[PDB]
Amino acid sequence: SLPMLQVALDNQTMDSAYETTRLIAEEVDIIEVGTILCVGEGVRAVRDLKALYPHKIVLADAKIADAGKILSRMCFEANADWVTVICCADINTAKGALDVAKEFNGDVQIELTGYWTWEQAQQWRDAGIGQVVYHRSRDAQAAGVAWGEADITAIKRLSDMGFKVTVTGGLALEDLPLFKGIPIHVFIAGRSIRDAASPVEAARQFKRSIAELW
Amino acid sequence: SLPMLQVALDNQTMDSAYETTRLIAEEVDIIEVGTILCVGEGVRAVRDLKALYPHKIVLADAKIADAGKILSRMCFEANADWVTVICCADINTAKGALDVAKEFNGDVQIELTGYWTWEQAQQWRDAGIGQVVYHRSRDAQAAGVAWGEADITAIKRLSDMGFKVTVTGGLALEDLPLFKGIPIHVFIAGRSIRDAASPVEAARQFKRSIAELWG
Numbered sequence A: 001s002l003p004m005l006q007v008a009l010d011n012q013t014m015d016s017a018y019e020t021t022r023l024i025a026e027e028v029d030i031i032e033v034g035t036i037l038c039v040g041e042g043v044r045a046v047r048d049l050k051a052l053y054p055h056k057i058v059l060a061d062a063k064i065a066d067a068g069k070i071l072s073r074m075c076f077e078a079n080a081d082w083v084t085v086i087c088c089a090d091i092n093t094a095k096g097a098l099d100v101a102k103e104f105n106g107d108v109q110i111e112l113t114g115y116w117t118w119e120q121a122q123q124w125r126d127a128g129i130g131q132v133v134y135h136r137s138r139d140a141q142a143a144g145v146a147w148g149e150a151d152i153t154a155i156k157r158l159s160d161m162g163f164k165v166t167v168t169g170g171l172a173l174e175d176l177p178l179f180k181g182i183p184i185h186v187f188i189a190g191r192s193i194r195d196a197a198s199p200v201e202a203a204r205q206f207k208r209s210i211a212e213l214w
Numbered sequence B: 001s002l003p004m005l006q007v008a009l010d011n012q013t014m015d016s017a018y019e020t021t022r023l024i025a026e027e028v029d030i031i032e033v034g035t036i037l038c039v040g041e042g043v044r045a046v047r048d049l050k051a052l053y054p055h056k057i058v059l060a061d062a063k064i065a066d067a068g069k070i071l072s073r074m075c076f077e078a079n080a081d082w083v084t085v086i087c088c089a090d091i092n093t094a095k096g097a098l099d100v101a102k103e104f105n106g107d108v109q110i111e112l113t114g115y116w117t118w119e120q121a122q123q124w125r126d127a128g129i130g131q132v133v134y135h136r137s138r139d140a141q142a143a144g145v146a147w148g149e150a151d152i153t154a155i156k157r158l159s160d161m162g163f164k165v166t167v168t169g170g171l172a173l174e175d176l177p178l179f180k181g182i183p184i185h186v187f188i189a190g191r192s193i194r195d196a197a198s199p200v201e202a203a204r205q206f207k208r209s210i211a212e213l214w215g
């Protein structure tokens, strides 16, 4: 339907995350336990946030690189809806995580941060993967890498292959028009919501502009 | 120089990890906080293990994919000696982690689990990475991927490029002779030590075989 709004909780502690959820939990559709929070607090972050917000989709942004069955199971036992597996994981890592996701009626997203190939994209599809995260790396961003037409072309191509596409990577309100006409599953905002002078206005403006555009 | 021995603590909780370290802390060179323990407990696992064993090298196997400076700094502020960065991460992720590692007199390894290229390997060298982890994925292993000749050639080639190479991925004692003749920096064992009937004896066996094969 409309692209969903996901907030990324890239916080080092639960209390710092709650400074954000206490403002905007009900202003978004998906609550992400960011990688920073996974590492900071471990999978307790997942269990706690779902207990708080059981009606929201909770994503554990673990960026699983190996041990797909074990790491996926930990996140799902903690009541995750969705987990991420990093694009360079062995194909059997993605398969494994996907098998466990199915036991729990959750799902796996392949996280397209850094280097990957079109052949691997095909492999994910054959394995049954239905979601990808098209992601301008935070560190690439800080080195001056901008969003551009090659990203739009790549997102359209992933969409045509059958994936539901999330878009993320230092997204600002003003960025949303670049993706107009594409059936984007989710837009993620971390900093542009958490660090805004008004996190509630920031999230409502993302939701408004999405409604305008789609 | 003998390859060193690293134990991987791929435990879901600290107490499970301690059931291993109380036995083998003194039998190995590097204590790894496994990716599974980092995700199970968070970076506290790093801080606590270092506090128990401050004389040992502690490796935080975070497999950082992005946000190099932030994630590295969390690990290093928890008193990690080494952190890992996954090989597909944007080159600025590695660079970012390395800069932080240098503030703490630490170091970064690139984790070669999954796909990568030789030009990328050169980029790592130019950025100043000195260590790589040649890793047969646990899940590749489970699907029947064996160690083989192609792995020898790649390892030697990494070493010739100037990297200290760590080898890992379901290693059993019988696999060590595959690598004889190559200046391997570290072998990692997780399951083969932790799940042995006697972890102590398992670690000692690895050390004996290493000392015979590289002596």
Ligand SMILES: O=P(O)(O)OC[C@H](O)[C@@H](O)C(O)NO
Binding pocket: A008, A009, A010, A034, A035, A061, A113, A135, A137, A138, A168, A169, A170, A171, A188, A189, A190, A191, A192, B066, B067
């Ligand atoms: O909008 P951002 O601050 O970039 O956060 C969203 C992004 O997807 C992060 O959670 C992330 O995973 N960075 O790697």
Ligand SMILES: O=P(O)(O)OC[C@H](O)[C@@H](O)[C@@H](O)NO
Binding pocket: A066, A067, B008, B009, B010, B034, B035, B061, B113, B135, B137, B138, B168, B169, B170, B171, B188, B189, B190, B191, B192
């Ligand atoms: O010997 P193993 O049980 O395979 O554990 C070592 C390995 O390096 C793990 O710690 C790991 O990182 N797997 O991805």
Ligand SMILES: [Mg+2]
Binding pocket: A008, A032, A034, A035, A061
């Ligand atoms: Mg994230």
Ligand SMILES: [Mg+2]
Binding pocket: B008, B032, B034, B035, B061
């Ligand atoms: Mg490990």
